[PDB]
Amino acid sequence: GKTNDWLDFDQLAEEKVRDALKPPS
Amino acid sequence: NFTTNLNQLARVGGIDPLIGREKELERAIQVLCRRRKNNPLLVGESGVGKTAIAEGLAWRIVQGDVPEVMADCTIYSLDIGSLLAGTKYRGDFEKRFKALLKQLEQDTNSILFIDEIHTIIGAGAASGGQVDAANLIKPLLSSGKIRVIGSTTYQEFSNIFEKDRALARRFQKIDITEPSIEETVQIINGLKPKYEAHHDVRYTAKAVRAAVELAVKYINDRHLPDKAIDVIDEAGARARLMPVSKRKKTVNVADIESVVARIARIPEKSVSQSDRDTLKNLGDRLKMLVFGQDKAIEALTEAIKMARAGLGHEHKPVGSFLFAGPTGVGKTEVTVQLSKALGIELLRFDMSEYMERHTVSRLIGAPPGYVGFDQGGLLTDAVIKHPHAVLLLDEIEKAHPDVFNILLQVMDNGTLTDNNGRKADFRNVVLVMTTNTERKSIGLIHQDNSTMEEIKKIFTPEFRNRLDNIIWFDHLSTDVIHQVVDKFIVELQVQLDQKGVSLEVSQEARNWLAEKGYDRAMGARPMARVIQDNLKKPLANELLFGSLVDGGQVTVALDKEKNELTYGFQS
Amino acid sequence: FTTNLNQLARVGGIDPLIGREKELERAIQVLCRRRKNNPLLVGESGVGKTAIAEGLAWRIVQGDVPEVMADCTIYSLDIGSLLAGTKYRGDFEKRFKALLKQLEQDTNSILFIDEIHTIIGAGAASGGQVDAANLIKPLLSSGKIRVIGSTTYQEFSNIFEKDRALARRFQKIDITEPSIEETVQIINGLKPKYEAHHDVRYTAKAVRAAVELAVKYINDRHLPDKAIDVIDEAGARARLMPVSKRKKTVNVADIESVVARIARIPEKSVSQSDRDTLKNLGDRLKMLVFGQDKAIEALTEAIKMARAGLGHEHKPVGSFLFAGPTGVGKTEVTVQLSKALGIELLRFDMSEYMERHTVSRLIGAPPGYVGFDQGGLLTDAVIKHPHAVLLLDEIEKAHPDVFNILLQVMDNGTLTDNNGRKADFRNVVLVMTTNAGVRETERKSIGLIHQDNSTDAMEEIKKIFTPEFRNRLDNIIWFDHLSTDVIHQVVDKFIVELQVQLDQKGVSLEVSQEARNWLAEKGYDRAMGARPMARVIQDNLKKPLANELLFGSLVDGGQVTVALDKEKNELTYGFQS
Amino acid sequence: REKELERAIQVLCRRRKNNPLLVGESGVGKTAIAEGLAWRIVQGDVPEVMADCTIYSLDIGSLLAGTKYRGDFEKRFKALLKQLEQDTNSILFIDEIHTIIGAGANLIKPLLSSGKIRVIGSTTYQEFSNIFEKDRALARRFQKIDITEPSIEETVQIINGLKPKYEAHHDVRYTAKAVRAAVELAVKYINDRHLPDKAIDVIDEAGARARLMPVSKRKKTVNVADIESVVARIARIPEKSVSQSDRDTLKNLGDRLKMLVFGQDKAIEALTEAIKMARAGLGHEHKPVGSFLFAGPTGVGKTEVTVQLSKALGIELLRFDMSEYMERHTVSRLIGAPPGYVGFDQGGLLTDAVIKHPHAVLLLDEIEKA
Ligand SMILES: Nc1ncnc2c1ncn2[C@@H]1O[C@H](COP(=O)(O)OP(=O)(O)OP(O)(O)=S)[C@@H](O)[C@H]1O
Ligand SMILES: Nc1ncnc2c1ncn2[C@@H]1O[C@H](COP(=O)(O)OP(=O)(O)OP(O)(O)=S)[C@@H](O)[C@H]1O
Ligand SMILES: Nc1ncnc2c1ncn2[C@@H]1O[C@H](COP(=O)(O)OP(=O)(O)OP(O)(O)=S)[C@@H](O)[C@H]1O
Ligand SMILES: Nc1ncnc2c1ncn2[C@@H]1O[C@H](COP(=O)(O)OP(=O)(O)O)[C@@H](O)[C@H]1O
Ligand SMILES: Nc1ncnc2c1ncn2[C@@H]1O[C@H](COP(=O)(O)OP(=O)(O)O)[C@@H](O)[C@H]1O
Ligand SMILES: Nc1ncnc2c1ncn2[C@@H]1O[C@H](COP(=O)(O)OP(=O)(O)O)[C@@H](O)[C@H]1O
Ligand SMILES: [Mg+2]
Ligand SMILES: [Mg+2]
Ligand SMILES: [Mg+2]
Ligand SMILES: [Mg+2]
Ligand SMILES: [Mg+2]
C-alpha cells in the first residue's frame, strides 16, 4: 500500500552567559 | 526601554482613522472593561487590519467617543527590537521586560499593545529550554491590572496558542472576518482624500472598485485590506511620475492596470479594454501560428470569450474543455500559443506517470502521516503559484479512475483542498484535456492503423456531462501539411538572420521533408527532429570553421537519385 | 558627521550613471508613496547596488527628476564613523538620534544606508556591536525622512521579510547585473579618470574583450566588479612591468597576460579561445581516451551545433545521456571534455538522492534543515562555476521528482533558489550516465540457442525515463564495448602503475604478451566493463609478490619473471635474486 | 614565489583596492611572501615606483597589552595609524588580520575607505569565508590573492637556506639527497598538509631523532633512513625494512588464525594476504587496507575470525553493532552531531574511534540491517 513516514524533531542548544567584571581602580 | 505611545501620535498625526470596525471595536472595549482576564487577542491573518484596530482605539479615546470608564487610557506599543536587544546575559530580558512593567504601574489606566505576540511570548529568553518565556506576564495578566492587547495570525494561534492552556485562558480571541470588496470600497473612500492631498491627485470611482476587484482576482498571496491600499498608493506615485507636461492629475483606470500588473508579475494580462482588442482577433493571430483544425479554433475562442465576458459561473472554472484529435494534430501548440496570447503561464502534466493507485496522491498530495506529505501536491502547488495559468493534462484517458474523480470535483465546485489545509482556487484556470499505436499491424500484410461514440465509450457520461464543450480536431490535410513545414523553414530563417545568412531553400526541398517529417500516426512530432539534424547540423559546422563566420550564403539541393538533401555554401 | 552626496553632484565630483535606468524609476516610484516609501536594494556584491543610489543624486542636479522631489538633498551615512568613540557611554545612540533631530528639522531629505543589514542586525551580523535597529524604527514609523538601504539575498532572507514592521516599511527591489553590452558603456564613462591616473591608453577592443572573457575564468564576483578591476590592474601592471621604455600602449595581448595570472592558468585564455578549442576538440579528445570513436564524435558535433547559435539561447548548451555500461571510459571522456574546454568538473552522485525529501535539498530545503543552511547544491555549485560541467551518475535510481528540476533547466535554463537568486544554465553542459539496459542485454534467454542479439535495450530507457524528459534530450549516446585491442592498453596502464610502485623498491616486473590476454578476458566483464581489471590485478598479481617480498628472494629487488603456463592455462610467477 | 610576489606589487600600485590579501592554507608560507618583499627593497629589484618604501610588521600581542583603564586600545591604534600615514610610503603588514577585525572596534575602516594607507593582510581560507564575505565593506577594499603551494624544486632551496639553523641547533648535517627525499616523500604521502610546513617538520624531527639516540656527540651525518622513518611515522604508511620480530607475526598469521578458527581457510587467506600486501607497500594509498563482506550460515566464524584477527595483530577492535542504526537519524552518532545542537559536545563514535586507533580493525556487524 503506502509507507508511513516519520518526522524527527531536532533540539537546539542555547546557553546564557554571565560576566565577571574587574574594578578599574 | 522606551515604548512607543499610540495616543501621542494620534494627537499630532500619523494615525489613520479606522472605518467600518464597529463590531470589532465594541468587542475589544467590552473585553478591556472586564475585571479579570481583560486582555484582548486580535486573531487574524496576514494583510488584514490587525494593527488598525489597536491604533483605531487610540484615535477614539483622543476624539472622546469612548465610554467614560474606558477614557483617559493611553495605549502603549512596545518596541520588540528594544526588549530583545542584548544577549548572552542572565538578566537582560528580565530587566528590560520588568522595567517596562514597572514604568507602566505609575499609570494604572494605561493599556499595552504588543504586536507579533508570538515572537516574544512564544520564546522570550528560552535559552537551553528555559520556561521563563511567557511565565512573567501570566500572573500579571490574570491578577495584575495591566492589559495586553495581542495580535497574532490564525495559523500561529494554532501552532503556539491553545497548547499552553494557562496562557490561553488569559486571552480573549477576537476573530476577524476579512471584509468583502464592498466593505473595502467604503474603507478606500474614507482614505481617498488623505492620499489625494499627499499626491495632489484624484481617484475615480471606477478605479477604486477596479483596484480592489483586480487585486482579489490576481493578487491572491496578499489579503484585501492591505493589498488594495498598496495599489491605490502605487497608482498615485505612478500617476504623478509618468506625466511629462501632460498634467494628468486625475487617476483613471489605466494607471490601476499598470501597477497591479507589475506587482502581480504578469505580462500585461490584468488590463481593462486591452484584452478586448486581442479577443476581437484572437483566432486570427492564433491562425498565423497554427495551420489546420480551423473549426477547433472557433470553439475554443468562443468559450474563452464567453467566460471572460463575466457571464460564467462563480463556483466553476472559466471553462473545461476536452480536446480530442489524433496525435500530432497540434492541440499542445494551440495551448502553448494561447497562454502566450492571453499572457498566462502554462502548466504541463502527463498522466502516463499517474496510472498507478498510489501515484494519484502526487497531484493533491499525500495524506498527513505518510510519505510525500511535506512537499505537497504538484497540481495544487502549481495552481496556487499561478492561479491564472492554463492547465494542460496530456493523455487524460490513461489516468486512473480515481484521478477522474479529482477532476470531477474541480469542474463541479472549482476548488481543491491541499493536504496542508490550503484551498487551491480553480475559478481562473483554463482546464484543457487532450485525448488521442506505434507498433505495426500484427498481420501477414501490414495495414493502416489510423483511428462521436468513441469518446462516450472511453469516458463515463458523468465526466462528459461536466465538460463545457468537447472540441474536435481534424486530421492534418495534405494541403495543410505544406503550410506546417513552412513555419519551420521561416523560423530557422529569422534565427539565421541574426547570424547574417539567407537560406535559398524553395518548395523543392520541402517536398521530401514533408513526407519524411510527417507521419499519419506520429503526426508532426518527428518534424522538429528533421530540421534538428538534416538542416541544422550541416550548416552549423561550416558556419563556425571560419568560411561563413563573417557573413555567409547558403542554399539547399535535393537530387532525385541521391534521395537526400545536399547543400551549397558561398561567402 | 553625515556626507551630503547631493552637494557632491553639484560640485561635479560624482560621475554620470551609465545604465540601470529601469531600476532608477522604481526607486523614484517608492519614494513618492505615502506608505512603504523606503527603497531596499537586495543583490549580490559587485552588482553596483550603491551605484544606483549615487546616480540618483546626480539626476536631481540635472533636473530630469520630477520637481516634487527636486529640492530633496539625498544624504548618506557610514557605520564606521557612527561606531567611533565606543568608549563613550551610548555615544553611538546619542549621536545617531542627534543626527535625526537635525534631519527632522529640515524634514525634507533621503538618507542612503549602505549595508543596512548591519544596522538592523544588532548582533545578528558577524562581530556586530551596533544597536541601531531599534533607533531607526521611530523615524521610519513617523515617515518624516525616507531611507535607502543595501543588502544581499542571504541577509535579506534571514533578516528581511520576517519582521512585519520592516515588511510594511521597506520594498523589495530586484537589482540585476547588466547586459554585456551595457558593461562596455560603463567602462567608457570612467575612461578619463582611470586613464589619467595611470597615464595609459587602452583601445575599445581591449575593454570589450575583457568583459566577454573575464566572466569565463572569474566567478568570485559579478560582471561589473572584476572588469573595473581588470582594466585598473592591466594599467598598473603595464605601468611598472617595464623597467624602462614604458609600453603605455595597451592592446588585446596585454590584457590576456594579466587575466591569465589572476586566473591561475598557463596562458590558455584567448579572445576567441572557444573557436580554437572547438576545432581541435575531436582530435585532441580521441588521443586522450582510446575507443568510443562513434560516441566521442557524436558528442563533439552536439557541442559545435550549440555554440553556433542557431537554436534557443535560453536552453542549455547541451543535454546528453551517456547510455551504455560502466567501465567503458564514459566518466573519462567527461573528465577530459572539461579539461579540454578549460572548465571545471562538478561530479554529483545521484545515488544519494534516491528519496523524495533529498530532492528538495538540491534546490534548498525548508528552514531548520541541514541542506537549507548550506543551500541548494545544484544551484550553489552552478553559481560557483557557471562554466563547468555537471555529471549526474545513475539517474535511473533517482526519484521521478528529480526529473522535474532537470526539466526546468532544459526548458528554461534557470532554476530559482529559495534565496531568490536565479541560476544560469545557458553556459553549462549536463551529462548523465545510466546502466539501464545492460542487465537486459546480458539476460540469457530460455532456449537451446542463446539469443545473442539482445541489444534492443532502448525500451528500458523509455520505460524508466518518461518520454517528456528524453524528448528534450539531444542524443542518447550509446557507449560501445571495448575491443580486445583497447583492453590490452588498459592492462598495460595498470601494469605500468604497478611497475612504478615496484621501481621505488628496486623490483622489476616482466609480463609476457600471452599472460596479458588472460587478464583481458577475466579482467573485463561485458556487464561490468573494465572496472574489475583493478581488482583482478590485485588478486592475481600483487598477492603472490607480497609473500615473496616480505620473506623470500625478493626481500631486496632481485628479479621477477611472470609467464603463463600453456598446460594449465594459469599464470606462473618466476622469482629470482 | 616570483609570480605570487608579482601579484602583490601590482595590486599595491593600483589606484583603488590597493590592499593585497594573501589568502592561503595553513603552513603555505604566507608570511614569507610579505617578509620576502622587504628583502627585495634593500636589493633594489622591486620596481622604482614602490622603491624606498618601508614595511612595518604589526604585533597584535604588543598592542593588546592594554595598561590604561580601557583607553589604551583606541589610543594605541589611533597614534600608530597616524605615524604610518604621515610618511605616505609605508605599507603596513598585519599577519593574522582576522584577529584585528574581530572584537578585542578595529577603527581602521575609515583608513581603508580613504585608501591613503596600504595594509597587507594574511588570513586562512576558512576564516576568510566565515567573516570577510559577510562584511562586504571590509572585503571590498581587500583583493583576495591565491597561494596554494611552492614548486618542488624551489622547496629544496628554501630548506637549504634554513638548513644552517637546524644543523647548528641539532648539531647534525643534512645531506643533499636527504633534503630531496624529504620533499618528494612528504608531498606524496602527507596530502592533508602543505609542502612548506611538513618539509620543515620532518627535517626538524629527523635531526632530533639522530642526536637523541647517542648520549655523547655522535651520528652527525643524517641518512635517508631517518627521513623515511619520520615521514612514515606522520603519514602512517607502513615502513619498509621490516624487522625480523614483526616478520613472524605476518608469516604465522594464517596458522594462528587457523588454530583458533577451523575451516573457512579462504577467509583467513584473504585477510592475511591483504594485510601482508599493505606492509609490502603494494596497496591503495587512498582506500582502507581491506574491505571484506563476510556472508554465510549461522555460526561459521564470520565474527570470530575478525575478533581473533585483532588479537593476533594486537590492534583494538572497533566493533559496531549496525542493528542499533536502523533509522536514518542514527547516522549522526557515527558521522558526528551538528555544531550547534544539544549533542554537539559528544563526538562521532566512528570518527573519534578511528582517530584514537588508526590501525584498529573496524567490524560492522550486520551491515545489511543498517
Ligand atoms: N497544426 C500545426 N501547426 C503548426 N505547428 C504544428 C502543428 N501541429 C504540430 N505542429 C508542430 O509540431 C510540434 C510537435 O507536435 P506536438 O505539439 O508534440 O503534438 P501533440 O500535442 O503531441 O499532438 P496532439 O495531436 O495534440 S496529442 C508542435 O509543438 C509544433 O511545433
Ligand atoms: N618563498 C619562500 N621563501 C622563503 N622561505 C619560505 C618561502 N615559502 C615558505 N618559506 C618558509 O616557510 C616558513 C614560513 O611559514 P609562515 O608563512 O610563517 O607560516 P604561517 O602562515 O604562519 O602558518 P599558519 O599555519 O598559517 S599559522 C619559514 O620557514 C620560511 O622560510
Ligand atoms: N569456524 C569456526 N571455528 C571455530 N569456532 C567457531 C566457528 N564458527 C563459529 N564458532 C564459534 O561459535 C560462536 C559464535 O561464532 P561467531 O563467529 O561469533 O558467529 P557468527 O558467524 O557471527 O554468527 P551469525 O549467526 O552468522 S551473526 C563462538 O563460540 C565461536 O568461537
Ligand atoms: N479598516 C481599515 N481602515 C483603515 N485602514 C485600514 C483598515 N484595515 C487595514 N487598514 C490599513 O492597513 C495598513 C497595513 O495593515 P495594518 O492595518 O497595519 O495591519 P497589519 O499590521 O495586520 O498588516 C495600515 O496602513 C492601515 O491603515
Ligand atoms: N551601472 C554602474 N554605473 C556606474 N558605476 C558602476 C555601475 N556598476 C558598477 N559600477 C562601479 O563598479 C563598482 C561596483 O561596486 P558595488 O557593487 O556598488 O559595491 P558594494 O557591493 O560594496 O556596494 C563601483 O566602483 C561602482 O562605481
Ligand atoms: N577506454 C578506456 N581507456 C582507458 N582506461 C579506461 C577505459 N575504460 C575504462 N578505463 C579504466 O578502467 C577503470 C574504469 O572503472 P572506474 O571508472 O574506476 O569505475 P568507478 O567509476 O566505479 O570508480 C578506470 O581505471 C579507468 O581509467
Ligand atoms: Mg501593523
Ligand atoms: Mg556599492
Ligand atoms: Mg568509467
Ligand atoms: Mg610567519
Ligand atoms: Mg555475527
PDB file of N, CA and C in Angstrom, chain C residues 512 514-522 540 563-573:
ATOM      1  N   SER C 512      54.604 -11.490 -19.918  1.00  0.00           N
ATOM      2  CA  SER C 512      54.542 -11.890 -21.314  1.00  0.00           C
ATOM      3  C   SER C 512      53.260 -11.375 -21.963  1.00  0.00           C
ATOM      4  N   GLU C 514      51.176 -13.136 -23.781  1.00  0.00           N
ATOM      5  CA  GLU C 514      50.090 -14.096 -23.623  1.00  0.00           C
ATOM      6  C   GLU C 514      49.440 -13.976 -22.251  1.00  0.00           C
ATOM      7  N   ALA C 515      50.237 -13.698 -21.215  1.00  0.00           N
ATOM      8  CA  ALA C 515      49.687 -13.542 -19.873  1.00  0.00           C
ATOM      9  C   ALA C 515      48.696 -12.387 -19.820  1.00  0.00           C
ATOM     10  N   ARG C 516      48.996 -11.297 -20.530  1.00  0.00           N
ATOM     11  CA  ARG C 516      48.102 -10.144 -20.554  1.00  0.00           C
ATOM     12  C   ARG C 516      46.740 -10.516 -21.125  1.00  0.00           C
ATOM     13  N   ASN C 517      46.717 -11.401 -22.125  1.00  0.00           N
ATOM     14  CA  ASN C 517      45.452 -11.808 -22.729  1.00  0.00           C
ATOM     15  C   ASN C 517      44.560 -12.507 -21.712  1.00  0.00           C
ATOM     16  N   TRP C 518      45.155 -13.298 -20.815  1.00  0.00           N
ATOM     17  CA  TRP C 518      44.373 -13.968 -19.782  1.00  0.00           C
ATOM     18  C   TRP C 518      43.673 -12.949 -18.894  1.00  0.00           C
ATOM     19  N   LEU C 519      44.388 -11.887 -18.517  1.00  0.00           N
ATOM     20  CA  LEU C 519      43.808 -10.831 -17.699  1.00  0.00           C
ATOM     21  C   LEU C 519      42.703 -10.091 -18.441  1.00  0.00           C
ATOM     22  N   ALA C 520      42.825  -9.973 -19.764  1.00  0.00           N
ATOM     23  CA  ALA C 520      41.835  -9.247 -20.553  1.00  0.00           C
ATOM     24  C   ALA C 520      40.460  -9.897 -20.471  1.00  0.00           C
ATOM     25  N   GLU C 521      40.387 -11.214 -20.679  1.00  0.00           N
ATOM     26  CA  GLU C 521      39.094 -11.889 -20.644  1.00  0.00           C
ATOM     27  C   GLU C 521      38.514 -11.916 -19.235  1.00  0.00           C
ATOM     28  N   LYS C 522      39.352 -12.173 -18.231  1.00  0.00           N
ATOM     29  CA  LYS C 522      38.882 -12.219 -16.851  1.00  0.00           C
ATOM     30  C   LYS C 522      38.669 -10.822 -16.283  1.00  0.00           C
ATOM     31  N   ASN C 540      45.481 -11.406  -8.509  1.00  0.00           N
ATOM     32  CA  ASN C 540      46.308 -12.332  -9.276  1.00  0.00           C
ATOM     33  C   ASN C 540      47.781 -11.957  -9.347  1.00  0.00           C
ATOM     34  N   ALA C 563      55.021 -15.515 -16.277  1.00  0.00           N
ATOM     35  CA  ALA C 563      54.748 -16.204 -17.531  1.00  0.00           C
ATOM     36  C   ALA C 563      53.545 -17.123 -17.371  1.00  0.00           C
ATOM     37  N   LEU C 564      52.734 -17.198 -18.423  1.00  0.00           N
ATOM     38  CA  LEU C 564      51.557 -18.054 -18.437  1.00  0.00           C
ATOM     39  C   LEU C 564      51.949 -19.489 -18.769  1.00  0.00           C
ATOM     40  N   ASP C 565      51.267 -20.444 -18.135  1.00  0.00           N
ATOM     41  CA  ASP C 565      51.514 -21.866 -18.345  1.00  0.00           C
ATOM     42  C   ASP C 565      50.475 -22.396 -19.326  1.00  0.00           C
ATOM     43  N   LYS C 566      50.939 -22.864 -20.488  1.00  0.00           N
ATOM     44  CA  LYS C 566      50.018 -23.354 -21.510  1.00  0.00           C
ATOM     45  C   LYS C 566      49.308 -24.633 -21.077  1.00  0.00           C
ATOM     46  N   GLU C 567      50.020 -25.545 -20.408  1.00  0.00           N
ATOM     47  CA  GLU C 567      49.404 -26.804 -19.996  1.00  0.00           C
ATOM     48  C   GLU C 567      48.274 -26.576 -18.999  1.00  0.00           C
ATOM     49  N   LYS C 568      48.481 -25.685 -18.028  1.00  0.00           N
ATOM     50  CA  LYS C 568      47.480 -25.387 -17.011  1.00  0.00           C
ATOM     51  C   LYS C 568      46.622 -24.175 -17.347  1.00  0.00           C
ATOM     52  N   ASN C 569      47.058 -23.332 -18.285  1.00  0.00           N
ATOM     53  CA  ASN C 569      46.321 -22.127 -18.662  1.00  0.00           C
ATOM     54  C   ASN C 569      46.137 -21.206 -17.457  1.00  0.00           C
ATOM     55  N   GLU C 570      47.173 -21.125 -16.621  1.00  0.00           N
ATOM     56  CA  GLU C 570      47.170 -20.277 -15.439  1.00  0.00           C
ATOM     57  C   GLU C 570      48.501 -19.544 -15.354  1.00  0.00           C
ATOM     58  N   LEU C 571      48.456 -18.336 -14.800  1.00  0.00           N
ATOM     59  CA  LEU C 571      49.659 -17.528 -14.655  1.00  0.00           C
ATOM     60  C   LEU C 571      50.659 -18.199 -13.720  1.00  0.00           C
ATOM     61  N   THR C 572      51.931 -18.178 -14.117  1.00  0.00           N
ATOM     62  CA  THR C 572      53.028 -18.723 -13.325  1.00  0.00           C
ATOM     63  C   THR C 572      54.019 -17.599 -13.065  1.00  0.00           C
ATOM     64  N   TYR C 573      54.470 -17.483 -11.817  1.00  0.00           N
ATOM     65  CA  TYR C 573      55.396 -16.436 -11.403  1.00  0.00           C
ATOM     66  C   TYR C 573      56.768 -17.018 -11.099  1.00  0.00           C
TER      67      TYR C 573
END
